[PDB]
Amino acid sequence: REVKLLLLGAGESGKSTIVKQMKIIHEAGYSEEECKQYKAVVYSNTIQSIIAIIRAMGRLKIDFGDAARADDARQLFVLAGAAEEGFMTAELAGVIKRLWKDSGVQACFNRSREYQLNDSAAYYLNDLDRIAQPNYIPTQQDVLRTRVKTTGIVETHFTFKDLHFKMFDVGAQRSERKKWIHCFEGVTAIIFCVALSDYDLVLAEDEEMNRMHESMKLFDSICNNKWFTDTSIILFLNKKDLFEEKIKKSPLTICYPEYAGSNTYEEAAAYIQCQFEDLNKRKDTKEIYTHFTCATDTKNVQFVFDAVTDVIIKNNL
Numbered sequence: 001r002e003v004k005l006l007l008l009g010a011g012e013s014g015k016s017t018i019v020k021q022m023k024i025i026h027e028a029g030y031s032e033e034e035c036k037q038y039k040a041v042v043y044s045n046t047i048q049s050i051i052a053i054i055r056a057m058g059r060l061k062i063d064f065g066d067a068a069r070a071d072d073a074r075q076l077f078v079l080a081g082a083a084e085e086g087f088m089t090a091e092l093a094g095v096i097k098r099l100w101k102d103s104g105v106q107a108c109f110n111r112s113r114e115y116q117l118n119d120s121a122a123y124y125l126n127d128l129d130r131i132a133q134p135n136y137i138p139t140q141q142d143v144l145r146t147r148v149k150t151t152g153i154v155e156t157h158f159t160f161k162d163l164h165f166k167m168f169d170v171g172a173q174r175s176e177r178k179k180w181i182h183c184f185e186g187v188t189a190i191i192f193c194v195a196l197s198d199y200d201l202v203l204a205e206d207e208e209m210n211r212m213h214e215s216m217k218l219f220d221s222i223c224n225n226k227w228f229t230d231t232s233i234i235l236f237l238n239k240k241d242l243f244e245e246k247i248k249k250s251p252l253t254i255c256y257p258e259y260a261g262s263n264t265y266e267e268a269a270a271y272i273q274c275q276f277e278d279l280n281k282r283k284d285t286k287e288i289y290t291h292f293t294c295a296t297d298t299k300n301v302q303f304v305f306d307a308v309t310d311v312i313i314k315n316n317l
C-alpha cells in the first residue's frame with residue numbers, strides 16, 4: 001500500500017528537519033561527501049547568527065563587555081561584507097570566538113526573543129572550534145541543525161513495514177493558501193508541526209504578532225477543513241528540548257495571559273496541547289494524535305514515527 005503524508009506547519013517548525021531524518025532513518029543517510037555540501041551552510045548559518053546578535057545590541061543599546069570587541073565587531077563586517085559565500089578562516093574564527101565569549105554579547109543573546117535569531121545559533125557558536133577546522137566536514141547533527149528555507153515542494157519516498165510512504169513538504173506559504181491546499185484532498189495523514197519554543201516570540205515583519213497564535217490560527221484552518229475529514233491529523237509539538245530550557249525562565253503567560261497553572265515543563269506543555277486540540281470542532285468524529293518531538297534527535301523521531309505508522313495502519317490503509 002502507498003501512504004501519502006503532508007507535512008504542514010508555520011515557518012521554522014521543523015518540517016524540513018523531519019524530511020532529513022527520514023533519509024537518515026529510513027534511507028541511505030548523509031554520507032561524507034553529502035555532508036561536505038552542507039559545510040558552507042554551516043558557515044553561512046554561523047556568520048549570520050553572530051551578526052544578528054552583534055546588530056541587536058545596537059537596537060537594544062547593550063554595550064560590549066571589553067571595548068576591544070568593538071574592533072572585532074568591525075572586523076566581522078570586513079570579512080563577512082567581503083566574501084560572497086559562507087566560508088571560514090582562522091581569523092574569522094578568532095573574531096567570532098572573542099565576540100561570542102563577550103559579556104555584552106551574551107547579555108544580548110539572553111534577550112534573543114526580542115529579535116530574530118536562528119535556534120541553532122548557540123550550537124554552532126559553541127562548537128566553533130570544531131567547525132572552524134581547515135578540513136571540517138559537517139556531522140549528521142550539524143546538517144540537521146542547518147537552516148535552509150524551502151522554496152519548492154519537497155518529496156520523499158521511503159518504505160517502512162512494507163508500506164511505502166510519500167512525504168510532501170510544501171512550506172508555510174502554501175500551507176496557508178486556502179484554495180490551493182485542495183489538491184491534497186485525499187491524503188492519508190497530515191503531520192502538523194508546531195514550534196513549542198515560539199510561545200514568547202513574534203514574527204520579524206509583524207513585530208507584534210505572536211507566532212504560537214499564528215500557528216494556532218493555521219491549525220484551526222487545516223484541522224476543521226472539509227477536505228481532510230478522512231485524513232489523520234497528527235500534531236508534532238516540536239522543539240520540546242528548547243521549550244524545556246525556556247519555560248523555566250519565560251512564563252507561558254506571555255503567550256496565554258489567562259494561563260493560571262504553574263510554569264513547569266509538565267503543566268505548560270499540557271496547556272499548549274489542550275489549546276491546540278480544543279480548536280478541533282469534530283471532537284467526537286475526528287481525533288487528533290499529538291506527539292512531543294525533538295526533530296533534531298534521530299532516536300526520538302524514530303520512536304515517534306514508529307508510533308505514527310502504527311496508527312495509520314490501524315485506520316487508513
Ligand SMILES: Nc1nc2c(ncn2[C@@H]2O[C@H](COP(=O)(O)OP(=O)(O)O)[C@@H](O)[C@H]2O)c(=O)[nH]1
Pocket residue numbers: 009010011012013014015016017018118119120144145146147148150238239240241242293294295296
Ligand atoms: N534544537 C532544535 N532545533 C530544531 C528542532 N527542530 C528543528 N530545529 C531547527 O529549526 C530551524 C528551522 O527548522 P526547519 O526544519 O528548517 O523548519 P521549516 O521552516 O518548518 O522547514 C533549523 O535550524 C532546525 O534545525 C528541535 O526540536 N530543536
